[PDB]
Design a protein around this nucleic acid. Sequence first.
RNA 1: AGAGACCGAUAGCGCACAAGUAGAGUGAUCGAAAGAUGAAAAGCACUUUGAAAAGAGGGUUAAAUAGCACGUGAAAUUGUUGAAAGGGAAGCGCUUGUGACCAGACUUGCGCCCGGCGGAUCAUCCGGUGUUCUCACCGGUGCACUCCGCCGGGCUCAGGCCA
RNA 2: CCGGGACCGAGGACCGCGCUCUGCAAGGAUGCUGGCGUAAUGGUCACCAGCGACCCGUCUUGAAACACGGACCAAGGAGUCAAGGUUUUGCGCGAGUGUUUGGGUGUAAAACCCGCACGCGUAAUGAAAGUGAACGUAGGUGAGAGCUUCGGCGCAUCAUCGA
RNA 3: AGACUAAUCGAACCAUCUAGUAGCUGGUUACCGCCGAAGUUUCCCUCAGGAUAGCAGUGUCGACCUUCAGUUUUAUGAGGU
RNA 4: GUCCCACCCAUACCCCGCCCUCAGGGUAGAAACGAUGCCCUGAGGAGUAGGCGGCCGUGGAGGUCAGUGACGAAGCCUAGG
Lengths: 183, 52, 124, 149, 141, 148
Amino acid sequence: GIDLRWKHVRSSHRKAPKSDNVYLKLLVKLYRFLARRTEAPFNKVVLRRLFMSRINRPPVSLSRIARNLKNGNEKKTVVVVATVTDDNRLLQVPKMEVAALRFTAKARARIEAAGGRTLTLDQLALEKPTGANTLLLRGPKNAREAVKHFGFGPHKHKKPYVRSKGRKFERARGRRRSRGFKV
Amino acid sequence: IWRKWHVKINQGQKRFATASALAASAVAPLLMARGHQVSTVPEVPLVVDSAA
Amino acid sequence: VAAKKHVPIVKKRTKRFMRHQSDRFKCLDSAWRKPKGIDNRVRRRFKGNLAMPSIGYGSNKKTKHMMPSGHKAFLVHNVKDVELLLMHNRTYAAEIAHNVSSRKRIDIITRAKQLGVKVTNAKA
Amino acid sequence: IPPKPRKILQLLRLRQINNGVFVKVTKATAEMIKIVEPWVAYGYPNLKSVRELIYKRGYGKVNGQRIPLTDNAIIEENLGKYGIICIEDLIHEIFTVGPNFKQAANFLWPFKLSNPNGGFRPRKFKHFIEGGDLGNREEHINALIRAMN
Amino acid sequence: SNVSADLIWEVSRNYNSFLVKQRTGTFSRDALNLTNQHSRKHAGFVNDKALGIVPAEKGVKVIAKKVKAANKPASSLYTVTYKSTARKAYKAIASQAAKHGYRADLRQAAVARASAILRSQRPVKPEPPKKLRGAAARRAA
Amino acid sequence: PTRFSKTRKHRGHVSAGKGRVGKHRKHPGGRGMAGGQHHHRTNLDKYHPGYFGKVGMRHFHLLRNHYWRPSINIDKLWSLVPSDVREQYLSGQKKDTAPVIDLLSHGYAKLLGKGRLPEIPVVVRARYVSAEAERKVKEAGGVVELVA
RNA sequence: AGAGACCGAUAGCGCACAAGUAGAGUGAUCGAAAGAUGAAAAGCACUUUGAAAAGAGGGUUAAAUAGCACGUGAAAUUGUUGAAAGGGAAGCGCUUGUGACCAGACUUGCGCCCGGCGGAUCAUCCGGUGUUCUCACCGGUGCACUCCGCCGGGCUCAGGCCA
RNA sequence: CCGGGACCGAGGACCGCGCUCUGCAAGGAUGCUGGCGUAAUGGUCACCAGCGACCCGUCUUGAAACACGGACCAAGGAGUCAAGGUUUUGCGCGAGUGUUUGGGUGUAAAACCCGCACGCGUAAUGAAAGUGAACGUAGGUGAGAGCUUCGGCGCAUCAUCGA
RNA sequence: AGACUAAUCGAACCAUCUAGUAGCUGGUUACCGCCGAAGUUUCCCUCAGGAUAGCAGUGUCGACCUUCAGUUUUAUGAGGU
RNA sequence: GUCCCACCCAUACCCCGCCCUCAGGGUAGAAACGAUGCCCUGAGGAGUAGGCGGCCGUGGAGGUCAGUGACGAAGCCUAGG
């Protein structure tokens, strides 16, 4: 006997992509080699984010990129391991160079129209193998419809499951002191 | 008889796949690996000068 | 020809793990089945009963799948298949399928002798 | 085993039968040992016993792994910053309680000993005074170490 | 581009017409495959540079791949036949594969495969008659 | 595809994963929404607070066409003009001509104002307009006119 | 009328057959079982024992281990022949012993020296073609202390089982 | 410091730490010799011998039970399908997205192409008439991976004060 | 006499609605590997039954955050066996 | 009743071999690799109700082995491997 509390406990994070894209398999091979034989911490972070599922890689927009291009960051390279989406609100697009997993049709056109350049994760390793002069970005993880229903309960101010919305659907008892109580 | 026989798939995905298959038809190593006998053809994108 | 030098082969077991209570009823085959009874004496590992198969009975990875000669069986069906063993004659051995005709059986044996490949079932 | 004495045995790194560790006696640790009386036996080691144990059963914790210590390069690589570079220094630190006793003692993996050669007493779950084996026996623990080592 | 040797291995890694998979091991019936194993290193039909040896009536016949004419398969093989001497054939094959950096890792396998083919064209000795151990009493009558 | 599902892994195990003491009987607890006020109250109050009761006055023969008026904010107003013409105005090459946008032709009735507007005069023709939206378009040199 | 990622004689309609038939009930009504010799009957002439049914010879056939109880013919249960055990149950697990029967493996390989036989052709050079542009093939030139195949003798090394 | 006995031989060019330093017992066994080359070693089956071994399935706090079902064999025999929800995984496009009610065409229940409407999403709140989202570089403070001209800039997310 | 009404009577026989409902008995079909329980809280014409919280598995993300603990020592409060 | 020597054996403890699970490392100016591969190092393994992963068989459909067969396919019997 050994009197242990835990035994044969597994890991908690993904160790390989679940997708079977052939090109993504090549991209993992490149960065798995780079992370082993390079001291730059930028490479290790990029490798793990390639394994993540779609809900853990939310899209980023052109506006969010322009927000972080101030206060002395006009000359750095933006790297986003996700999709990049055009924003209809932004009227004037600044000049930038972006390395992203993929672009929408309109986002690519407007970036190069202003005088920019669109890169690729493989070209990024060829130009900046150590990731010097770069900044990483993420999308809003919690900005999803399904997240608003999480942890429903009294005094929580969450969103209920209703087949429609109107005065005939819920409200009434338990939502106003005029009919019994309130929550 | 009212079980689901047919299926529905997006027209965007249909066009993606038929374009992928055409690209793989120009690769000679892939042709051999599928069991074809192309050891005596001049060019793998074979074209005939409209004699037919 | 003789095979490569290898470590001695140990089996760890020879018996066949017969099924419980299959020696008293003719409706039960001898193939092993896991007993799921709530109060079965075999499932509870009582002393003096049949043993149960475990992963601890496995064989060495070095000598797995090899017959006492030292080779590994490979099923062949015609003379074109046996030529696949040209470069493996000290590790693999040929075996003719049971549905091969008698005429094609002697054609294969003749070809296999040129390459030095051992044939397990040739005396016919 | 009751829930409170079990937790103390976990903090002393004694999770298996016939294990052994070194502890320096203070008021903070004397009360912990007194709680688990009917589970342990302890005493005062001498020079020979500590010398034999390190040579024969000495293993070190390296990156969370049990690496047997057979070369002086292993000890220096992990205890060099505290001034210990050879296997004789490790013995010196343990036997004469030094400023870096805590790091040296925690480096050694808990010892694993076999059952005694001559056996125990007729009933081994009384106190040493009554005629058992568990409890404090002062210098008489050296004889038990010879058999179990 | 969108096609390379590495990509073709990804597509054909799991199944292809040349695969012979069964218990105790897997094999490949490929013309440009030495040792007849299924691996990226020995898969002739995917790599740009490959070697192959086929037995002739008297000696060995060696075919190689010309990287310049990949899209023209009718004229994409450089073939030559050696039927002079065992030692002379050995030297030519090794020089063909390890003097100008054309798959220098295949030097050892090409020579060994040629040695086996020539060994198989010799006359065969007669096998000694079989004996009996327990049926000797039966056949004594 | 039934070849890979959990019912195939239950072969050979008695009770098929439903338990021995509780034997998966026909309909314990009732059918549908039975017991809403008696024995399913605890679930129906932690979630769905407000199932029971009456609120508000009723409307006979409601016709939804009387209440059709989709709205559009002001920061998306410039997206209505085509791209080729749009870039000319923002770049600053016209300098003497103003566009007249017809919201009804694009399927809108009310012009709300939420974001910001660049300093180029425009003309907006809408059925309804908010109080805050009228000010922002007016201080940019433009004017809004009701059209019915 | 045309079809199927449908069933293949305990399945598919109750019915692949003289099936809403045979049969049960006063009546309304209830309602089965049952496909396959061989390519062709060529479906066994004649003799003999027997009261007869049938048997033994002899015939047809590629086959009667297909004979109208007929393609293939499993299990429960039974007969004959062979082997073995048994003082109020039998069966089973671990480990030897006796008797019967049996699969493997080994029976040579490489190299060197001497002797004998047979052949065209080893180094070198010239011409043509191909190719990874420096590596090769073909024709000619060689012509016996070189190269190749076989045979005989001698030597070193390795090779099966139990100790 | 000298004797006696038992069990074991994992690894497969060199590399390292050392010593008694022409070498070695120092990061895992080698050397010499004999009989036999087949039923001898080994494997299967039957029987005798030593020790062990209560009938399965099920409900139950508790089953070998004087608790129930089970004479034997062959074939059949039990979590399925549709509509509507929900979370997680793969894929296409992305402020948009969905061809197939329908039309054109066809080697014809396949494949290919086209568009007006419409569905969900982009704006909430009140019983209702109604009204309808920027003081600031889209705010201030404390933590934050990563980057950096070394001064600093600070994604996601957590808490808190404001508009 | 609750007797008799085709071997059927405290309400005949035949087909259909009908595969009538069951908080109640019985059964529920190949192998290996890893983790591993509960009979307790609140409400119900509730007590052979359900919802709710607890114990359990799997999928993950944020850092490898240096944070933590069924434990001892030191300082300082409460209790009525 | 009390004290003292020697000795016997558990699936428990120590050392060694082998199987699987988990964790941490090495492997491209590629003479290179079922990269889902190979090499080095450490610890652990009881289990009803229940959860997840990997594999083996049966009836059909698309592709492929230029697959076997009247010189004998499928099926059945067999203290023969």
